[PDB]
Every structure is written in C-alpha cells, then in structure tokens.
C-alpha cells in the first residue's frame, strides 16, 4: 500500500498473479503452492504499480531507472548528512550517467498536480483559477488579424487582378495553400518565367506603394 | 492536462477518476476472458460500481476517493455542478467581467448628484478600445495597433 494504488486494486492484481501461478504450477516438483504463487503474485502487483500509479504513464524500465535513482540519492544523503547534488548522484549512479542526465530523468519523473488543489483556508481558492488560456486567441489578437486581412486586401487592390491573383495563389491567402509557378501559369495560360515575372512586378509595385503609404509596417511586429 | 508556465503539468481530478474507471473496466474484461472464479469477478464488479459512483458523485455513497498522499476528496461531476462554488452559482448566475475596475472611494462633495470622480488611469484602460479608435481619428496614431503599442508603455503616453 501507499504506492499509488488502492488496497483493493492491489488485491485484484495479486489475483491475476494467483491465476498465472495456478495455470503454471507443477506439483511434481514437490513444492507447496504458496511458494510458487508468491512469485507471480509479487510479479503482478509490481507490474501494476509500475503501470498505473502515474497519471502520465512511464514505461516499466524507465520507472525502475527512476526508482534506482531515488534509492541512490537516498543512500548518498544518508551518508553525506545532506541532499546530493546532480553531480554526486551522477557519480554514485555509475558510468554513462552525467549530471545533465540525472536532471533530465528527474524532469521526466515530475508528476502532474491537481487543478483543484486549494491555496487558501477558504474554499474560494483553487489552483486552476490562476492559469490563463493561451490557446484560444485574444480579442486583441483576432482583431489584429482582421485589420491585417483588410489592409492586405486594400494594398492588393492597387494591383491589377492578374497580379493580385498570381500573388493570392503563390502565397495561399485563397484556398489555404501556395502553388508552384507551373500551376499559376497553367491557370493563367502563361509561362512559368512570365508568371514568376509578374509576381516579381506585383511584389515590386507593392513595395513601392508601401514605401509611400506605410499602412502595413505596424503589423510587422 | 495543461502545461503551466514552469513546464509542470496541471490536470483535473476528473482525469484520475476516469482513469480509475478504465483500469477497473479493463481488469474486469480481462478477468472475464481468462475465466476467473466467482468471488474475484464479484469483487471487480463491486469496485467498478464504486469507481463509477466516485466519478459521478464522489463521497455520495461510502468513502470518498482521494489522490495518494492527500486526505482531500476529488472533484467529481456532481461537486462541479452543485454547490456555492459549483458551476451554476459560480459561472452562470454571476461571472467575472471585462471592462471593470476597482479602487478606493473618497468623498467628492464638489460633484453633482449624477457625477463621480474616476482616475485617468482606470479611465484609459476601461475605455481602451474607444481610446484607440479616437486616437486614430485625430492624428495621435496611424492605426489601432500603433495606438495600442503607444499606450503599452507609460512614458510613451503624451
């Protein structure tokens, strides 16, 4: 108990162990049953503890490496009178192990923490109540993308609809994907050199309009 | 399952509850396939009931589930819905709200009855999109985003 899993969870894993042991037991060896069963029972409980007790699941060999590293540091501290540094542990752990590896193995072992863990005596305070949401865009962000889309349209309209269309294809502001020169030229019925060239002149006219009006600089961040 | 600033993970208690459920359901399916005795399947069935109980209303019947190393019951679906902090009276009869502020009250006897004294600072943030719009109207800034940049820092404010 006290190792990640409920007593009853532990008993049902020991019961899966008992099942393997019944189906694998050879009375002919003259051994009592308990002796052989205890092995498969211990085996089953340890595989469950290593397989479920972590919210973020970590392969069996890795859990064993983490636990070895635990016990090493505990020996090191019980002889040093103090906690060990990463370097002392990378020594007592053996070759192949440098301080950096101790560090990263710990950072991997870091269990998640509850969003409902309170901060205050009152129940008014959770830990989730301080975590923003960095995925859904802010209204500032969305509005800025809207003003960008509109100003890009405003400066694209000063181009002829052919060069505006060549650029809206070669970058993908329409349909979401950018095209090759052969596709823009087999759509416009023009050579890839010619469609690349009217892309050149479209970009150059847009650069001139931008040196003049300066309406798009503020969106370059 | 959110990575907070420090890189460490926050998570919800509904995750540990569901995980308990899937583990007891999977172990049950496997003790059935392997033909396990009665007593054992009875115990797995009971424990599975109690896992579904805890997910839906933890602590309602018998013990409350907890995460290891804590005496603190886990937040079940019922505790989310019901309660002074439950969703109903926490986010649907009252919400936190944008465009608000708060400060210390002082007596203003020179105000008319329909008036209040509101500091410049609270007023510049509480009216901030308007402030960008009218900052663009007059020459103070080229566009909305340049105005927001200009108000970002205090010393830039004119």
């Amino acid at each position: 108990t006290g190792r990640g899993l409920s007593f009853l969870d532990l008993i049902q894993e020991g019961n899966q162990g008992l099942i393997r042991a019944v189906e694998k037991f050879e009375y002919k060896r003259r051994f009592k049953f308990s002796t052989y069963a205890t092995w498969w029972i211990r085996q089953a409980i340890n595989r469950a503890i290593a397989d479920q007790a972590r919210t973020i699941r970590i392969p069996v060999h890795m859990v064993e490496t983490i636990n070895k590293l635990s016990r090493t540091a505990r020996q090191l501290q019980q002889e040093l009178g103090r906690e060990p540094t990463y370097e002392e542990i990378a020594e007592a752990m053996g070759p192949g192990w440098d301080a950096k590896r101790v560090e990263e193995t710990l950072k991997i072992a870091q269990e998640p923490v509850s969003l409902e863990t309170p901060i205050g005596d009152e129940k008014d305070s959770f830990y989730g109540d301080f975590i923003p949401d960095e995925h859904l865009p802010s209204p500032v962000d969305a509005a800025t993308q809207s003003l960008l889309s509109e100003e890009l349209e405003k400066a694209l309209s000063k181009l002829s609809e052919r060069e505006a269309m060549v650029l809206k294809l070669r970058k993908g502001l329409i349909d979401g994907r950018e095209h090759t020169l052969e596709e823009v030229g087999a759509f416009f019925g023009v050579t890839r050199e010619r469609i690349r060239q009217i892309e050149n002149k479209a970009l150059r006219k847009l650069k001139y309009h931008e040196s003049r009006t300066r309406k798009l600089r503020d969106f370059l961040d | 399952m959110v990575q907070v600033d420090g890189g460490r993970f926050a998570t919800s208690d509904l995750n540990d509850l569901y995980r308990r459920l899937i583990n007891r359901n999977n172990r049950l399916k496997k003790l059935l396939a392997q033909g396990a005795p009665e007593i054992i399947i009875r115990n797995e069935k009971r424990m599975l009931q109690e896992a579904v109980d805890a997910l839906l209303d933890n602590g309602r019947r018998g013990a409350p589930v907890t995460n290891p190393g804590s005496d603190r019951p886990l937040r079940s679906l019922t505790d989310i819905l019901s309660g002074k902090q439950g969703r109903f009276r926490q986010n649907l009869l009252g919400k936190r709200v944008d465009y608000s502020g708060r400060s210390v009250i002082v007596v203003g006897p020179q105000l008319k009855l329909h008036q209040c004294g509101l500091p410049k600072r609270m007023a510049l943030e509480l009216f901030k999109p308007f402030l960008l719009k009218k900052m663009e109207e007059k020459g103070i800034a080229p566009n909305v985003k340049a105005a927001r940049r200009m108000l970002e820092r205090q010393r830039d404010i004119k």
Binding site: F7, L8, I11 | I39, R42, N43, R46, M47, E50, G62
Partner: peptide
C-alpha cells in the same frame, strides 16, 4: 459497507 471488510469475509468463506 466497507468493501475490504466485505471481501475479507467472502474470502474467509473458502
């Protein structure tokens, strides 16, 4: 009422 006491009883049957 206490699942592990109940299961200890069912086990002490056999």
């Amino acid at each position: 009422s206490d699942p592990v006491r109940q299961y200890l009883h069912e086990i002490g049957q056999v």
